[PDB]
Design a protein around this nucleic acid. Structure first.
Lengths: 143, 50, 111, 155, 48, 116, 100
RNA sequence: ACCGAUAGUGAACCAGUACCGUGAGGGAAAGGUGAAAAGCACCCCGGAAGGGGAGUGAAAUAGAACCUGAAACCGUGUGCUUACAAGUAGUCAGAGCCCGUUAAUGGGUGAUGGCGUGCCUUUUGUAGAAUGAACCGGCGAGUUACGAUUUGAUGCAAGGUU
RNA sequence: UAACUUGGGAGUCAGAACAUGGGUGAUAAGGUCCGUGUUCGAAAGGGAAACAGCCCAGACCACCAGCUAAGGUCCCAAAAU
RNA sequence: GACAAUGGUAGGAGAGCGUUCUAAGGGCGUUGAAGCAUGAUCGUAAGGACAUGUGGAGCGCUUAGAAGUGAGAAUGCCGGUG
């Protein structure tokens, strides 16, 4: 009977920005995947993406607990026989932090078409800068 | 070898996408008036004028 | 109105004829004679016949201008097939289908 | 069945080594043109029951007409030769419904003939009363003599 | 009354007719169980 | 007599072919795949009628939780306070108070805190 | 200005002049039915929500009384010759909402 | 209370025939224009076949392939939809767009989300990489006789019954 | 809330896993053979990722209602950062 | 009313649906029967009606009776077509 459903005509999407300085990778990634997926709105519907547009900055300043700087290897296979490649969270927090952050958050979103389209709401930047000034980025903080 | 499974009539029509044949590449004869095939001699009336 | 001509039980497999018919479908009928007259294929003469008959049904027995005529609807349907045999080796026998077709062309004046 | 249908008696191909199903004869049930597995047999359907039940049924079939006004006694008919005109007239002057059973004492010639052309008139004698034909009709025409015949016969 | 005919109550039944689908109860194996000598046509140990 | 029945086979096969229209390809044309797909369809429908009462439940809880966290409460403590305060609306199904009338939702939240 | 009532084991949010489809009541065609179990009222001007509310109970017409579309319940067991088909049509009554 | 053209004779029809075999021998398929041939004069396109008209006819989408004319299958056009996507192909929820019924909580389509490994047989156990089926249609499997028994029904009842 | 007798009609005689008491094997086996109970067989639903036999629990049907069992509550994924 | 029950193979028991023919009754039908197609209809299921086109001459309904009485599987048989 009666139960609300959001439409393409009904949904509005806000932008947010959040420093990763002093943050843990997973402890930030969870609270940000929630915003991307859009389940802090009251008008959450599963089939359309009521999420938001998140900006992450200072991705070179995230932290790792314990001996993950040298442990915690990222593996990836090239589909050629013997084409497996390896990296470490140390050699990626300084070499490409804005893919460290991307992978951490995008493993937390469901692996479907709506999830693929919700992952690209995330805009990750090392350093304290971003080209998204024309969006009125609202300042969010975690919890 | 033998087909393990019959071809669905959607896959048949997908494979037959490019089986179309092309136009003949024809022009209007400046003497016959009727149509000729470019770089060929007018079957209808006379010469080639080239 | 809409004039049509038909050639029933022509001795060509219909999906060889549909090739040629996918060229003249929708053309100014002054072109379609020449198109069918210039192409390699073999189903072209026995379609030139049907087209010229459907155009000679426009001037005669109706009254239309055969310059104003586009080939509105051409197509080809299956007729009765002639099932024959071909001896393969070792006592085997393989069936043959000498298929036919019905070639239908409908020319109009757009009125 | 398989025995009677013409042909058969040869195995169409080897038991083994062809791709086809193993078949015994061309006249098995599933083959087009085969024998029929079961079905119509030339037989009979008549049976019997005790005589007392026969007389009981043939008395019920008449008590039903007496419950209603199906029965209507008359005298012995009179005819010189068979003629259906006077017979149909008499049947119409007695308020009789369409199908009447005209039960006469003995077999009669001047009644059977002038009756058996009409749609619904069946003449019969006390020697030939039927549980089927009493109940088929809805109007009896017995004579003053045949009724005593049936009450003497029936128990 | 030859068009209203009721036999006595409890005097006639349908015959059981096995081999006509799963809903009747006796559809596939027709009441005979599975493989064996008592599941073949004519198959049965003689009496006694 | 010989009952060469051939009018009923066609009739029920039509009645089952027409119950599968909109199915991809041969599933809507041939009796022996259309019949299987109609069986599977009835089974899926039986199951999904049961699950449809379970999906909207989680939906309503998701949205009530998203509303309560704005006032800085959990779903869990909200429902505890509600069930303890007596105020016993169909609180999951009526996730419409949270959307439609927001001031009344502040009302309910304050009562929930008052029951603690 | 709405109200939350509870009628057939199910709460319902209702406003003035709304059609509602409820399960089969005991009232006849046309005759008005007044709901006594109200759980919430408010929306725009007042806000009273309690364990239950005595008053302002919804007065609603009884518009129609019928049977919903036929669902065909089917379930089968694979490789075990066991299937079952029932039909079902759920009776309901539709009410118009007069007053709160 | 027999068949009605895959039925009934193998054979409704030039059938013990085509055909198959050295031979004995095996053996099919094949009915239906209309009330009446009135079986399409004449014109046009075409070598013809075949068409389009005009006719006959109650009807020619009854034109000798001639009653109805299903499904498979093959096509022509369009209303929604589809080229970043991992699909036992559906079911539940659902925006949008397009129509409008046996008039009723309408019909079509389906962006996206949840759940979800066909059917039959045989097995302790099969999504099974175990079997079977290309699809469609028709035909295709507990019967009959005579006896025994057990039940219900009925008629009489120390009798009952041919 | 069964038990028994008298009659009509049967199917079954290839069982499996787990827990426990044993033989055999090597205190091997998803081994094999017995006692004991359960589940599958003939059982759908929730959990063990998926997973006949493990844990919870036995589907008459419908509802966009509520309380719970095993198991859980950072995100995938409903509920404690 | 009240309360209880309603997963299920092998298997037992019961109640039904539909086809073909028969008897009796009572209908319909060139102002259009069966059949075929179309639909958004009715019943708890098997199933039934109705409207609409095509079709061109037989068909249903009620109560009983009698069965060559129901097809998705048999590397089934025959035909047609992929």
């Amino acid at each position: 009977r009666q139960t609300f459903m959001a439409n393409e005509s009904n949904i509005e999407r806000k932008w947010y920005v959040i420093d990763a300085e002093g943050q843990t990778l997973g402890r930030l990634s969870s609270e940000v995947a929630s915003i991307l997926r859009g389940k802090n709105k009251v008008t959450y519907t599963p089939h359309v993406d009521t999420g938001d547009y998140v900006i992450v900055i200072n991705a070179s300043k995230i932290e790792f607990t314990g001996n993950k700087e040298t442990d915690k290897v990222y593996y990836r296979h090239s589909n050629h026989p013997g084409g497996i490649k390896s990296i470490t969270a140390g050699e990626l927090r300084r070499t490409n932090p804005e893919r460290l952050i991307e992978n951490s958050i995008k493993g937390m979103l469901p692996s479907t078409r709506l999830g693929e389209k919700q992952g690209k709401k995330l805009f990750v930047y090392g350093g304290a800068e971003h080209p998204h000034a024309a969006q009125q980025p609202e300042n969010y903080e975690l919890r | 070898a033998v087909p393990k499974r019959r071809t669905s009539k959607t896959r048949k029509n997908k494979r037959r996408t490019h089986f179309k044949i092309s136009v003949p590449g024809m022009t209007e004869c400046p003497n016959c008036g009727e149509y000729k095939l470019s770089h060929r001699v007018c079957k209808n009336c006379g010469s080639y004028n080239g | 109105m809409e004039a049509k001509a038909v050639a029933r039980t022509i001795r060509i497999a219909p999906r060889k004829v549909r090739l040629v018919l996918d060229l003249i479908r929708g053309k100014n009928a002054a072109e379609a004679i020449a198109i069918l007259k210039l192409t390699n294929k073999a189903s072209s003469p026995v379609i030139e016949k049907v087209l010229m008959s459907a155009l000679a049904n426009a001037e005669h027995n109706y009254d239309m201008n055969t310059d104003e005529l586009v080939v509105k609807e051409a197509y080809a349907n299956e007729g009765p097939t002639l099932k024959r045999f071909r001896p393969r080796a070792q006592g085997r026998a393989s069936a043959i289908n000498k298929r036919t077709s019905h070639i239908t062309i409908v020319v109009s004046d757009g009125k | 069945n398989r025995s009677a249908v013409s042909g058969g008696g040869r195995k169409p191909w080897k038991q083994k080594g062809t791709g086809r199903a193993r078949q015994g004869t061309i006249r098995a049930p599933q083959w087009r043109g085969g024998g029929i597995v079961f079905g119509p047999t030339p037989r009979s359907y008549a049976y019997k029951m005790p005589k007392k039940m026969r007389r009981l049924a043939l008395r019920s079939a008449l008590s039903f007409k007496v419950q209603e006004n199906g029965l209507t006694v008359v005298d012995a008919f009179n005819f010189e030769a068979p003629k259906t005109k006077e017979f149909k007239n008499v049947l119409s002057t007695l308020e009789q419904p369409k199908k009447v059973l005209v039960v006469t004492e003995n077999e009669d010639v001047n009644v059977e003939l002038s009756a058996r052309n009409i749609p619904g008139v069946q003449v019969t004698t006390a020697q030939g009363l039927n549980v089927l034909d009493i109940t088929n009709a809805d109007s009896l025409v017995i004579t003053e003599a045949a009724a005593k015949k049936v009450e003497e016969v029936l128990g | 009354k030859l068009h209203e005919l009721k036999p006595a109550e409890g005097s006639r039944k349908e015959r059981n007719r096995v081999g006509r689908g799963v809903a009747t109860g006796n559809g596939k194996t027709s009441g005979r169980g599975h493989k064996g000598q008592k599941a073949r046509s004519g198959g049965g140990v003689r009496p006694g | 007599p010989r009952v060469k029945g051939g009018t009923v086979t066609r009739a029920r096969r039509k009645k089952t072919i027409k119950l599968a229209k909109g199915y991809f390809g041969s599933k809507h044309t041939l009796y022996k795949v259309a019949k299987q797909q109609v069986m599977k369809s009835g089974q899926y429908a039986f199951r999904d009628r049961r699950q449809r009462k379970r999906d909207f439940r989680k939906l309503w809880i998701t949205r009530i939780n998203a509303a309560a966290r704005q006032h800085e409460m959990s779903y869990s403590r909200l429902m505890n306070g509600l069930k303890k305060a007596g105020i016993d609306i169909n609180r999951k199904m009526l996730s419409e108070i949270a959307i439609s009338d927001e001031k009344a939702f502040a009302q309910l939240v304050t009562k929930a805190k008052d029951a603690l | 200005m709405f109200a939350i009532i509870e009628t057939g084991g199910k709460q319902i949010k209702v406003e003035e002049g709304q059609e509602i489809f409820v399960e089969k009541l005991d009232v006849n065609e046309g005759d008005t039915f007044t709901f006594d179990k109200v759980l919430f009222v408010g929306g725009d001007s007042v806000k009273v929500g309690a364990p239950t509310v005595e008053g302002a109970t919804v007065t609603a017409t009884v518009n129609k009384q019928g049977r919903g579309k036929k669902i065909t319940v089917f379930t089968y067991k694979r490789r075990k010759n066991s299937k079952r088909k029932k039909g079902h049509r759920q009776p309901y009554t539709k009410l118009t909402i007069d007053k709160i």
